[PDB]
Design a protein around this ligand. Structure first.
Ligand SMILES: [Ca+2]
Ligand SMILES: [Zn+2]
Ligand SMILES: [Zn+2]
Ligand SMILES: [Zn+2]
Lengths: 173, 173, 173
């Protein structure tokens, strides 16, 4: 992909990870196995680290950043929806970050959680496992259903396949 | 522009269409006559197709995508505002997709419609012709005025001219 | 960076300004001293001018544009948050444009002002100095505190340092 290293920090990207050449990864950024960074996404690891767990995907026009003392940590089987923005937050496993939504500094998102599209999780907000978050400021509206809890993973699995699909069949023309 | 083809699918772009080299078009994507894809926009046609009708424009940092069974179809004289995101939705003719707004899967937008900036049209939401949509979840608040109905087209026409302006006078330095 | 000139108009960029090669600057755009345009940001100066004052930063996946008669003017010590969008608005000094927020045409933002993340300042909206704006449509909710008024500047100063950090230690790999 389009990768840079800043000063001492250099990105650590597992070989099976997919990173679109139109995406931008800078500095201290960790990308685990079968992860994916899509077209025009930006992972700027120029102060605290940006860690992305396995089977996790960062969609298009998404931006990920941090603040002094607030690094961004993403768990496994996590989806970061198109045009979303995560700034110095901690996200657990099996989580869907809605499209064009915003997760702010100090935020702690639990596992098996869905954040609604366009939602804004306030700074230092703690979201319990199995929660559906909506609104601005975003808030827990109810617990996930079995079908949504199943989706919290399938969506990530779908992207693992997509990533592989681009690694092998993508071709510039 | 920055165009890729994935597996069997290759983008079909009318000669008069404008596609910024900083934009990204992937796979099964159709771009009709005098259409325009602007800087940093992303049209990822890696599962269902992304179809864009005539005199339609996809502005900067915009992302367009789909889901299995939910392809994205854009009509004519349609504006997709800066930083907006359209995912597997059907949009009619003469429509203004507001800036940083979101249109979700299964959504059916009628003709001569304006979607407010930052608005979020829920999944499978059907928006009647001549409607002004606002909020999150977005909802019809009132019918378009004659002046807005005139704007639903002029805005697209303005971009057709802009596109031509870049095709002829744009120059990298 | 990735800079283009359109027709007669060519970007005027102070030597100390930082412009990521993944960012896009087009046409009539002015970037003052120690300013910064970050990864994937877009400053399209293809109708009215886009002016950016000193110590100001335009973060990732941000889009800045204008409309006929409505040029975009950004003051000094101004932060334009990740994924935000400014369209033909006038912004004063010491202002924080929240993440994924939207500032529309005709808007007049005063000095020492903070716009909440995901907020949408309506067209022609005038925001008084020292205000905290929230919601959609965005509105003044209360006046800034001394700590926030101090932050209105520190945040910009932090980026001036960051910019310098990339200019000297950034390296593609
Ligand atoms: Ca972008
Ligand atoms: Zn930041
Ligand atoms: Zn998607
Ligand atoms: Zn525009």
């Amino acid at each position: 992909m389009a990768i840079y290293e800043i000063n001492g920090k250099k990105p650590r990207i597992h070989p099976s990870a997919f990173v679109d050449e139109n995406a931008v990864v800078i500095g201290d950024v960790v990308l685990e196995e079968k992860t994916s960074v899509w077209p025009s996404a930006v992972l700027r690891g120029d102060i605290e680290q940006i860690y992305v767990g396995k089977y996790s995907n960062v969609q298009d026009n998404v931006s990920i950043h941090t603040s002094h003392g607030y690094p961004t940590e993403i768990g496994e089987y996590v989806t970061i929806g198109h045009n979303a923005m995560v700034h110095g937050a901690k996200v657990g496993n099996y989580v869907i970050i809605g499209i064009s939504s915003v997760i702010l500094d100090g935020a702690k998102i639990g596992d098996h959680v869905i954040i609604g599209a366009g939602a804004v999780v306030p700074p230092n907000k703690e979201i319990p496992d199995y929660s559906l978050v909506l609104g601005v400021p975003g808030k827990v509206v109810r617990q996930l259903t079995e079908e949504e809890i199943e989706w919290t993973k399938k969506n990530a699995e779908i992207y693992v396949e997509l990533a592989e699909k681009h690694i092998k069949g993508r071709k510039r023309i």
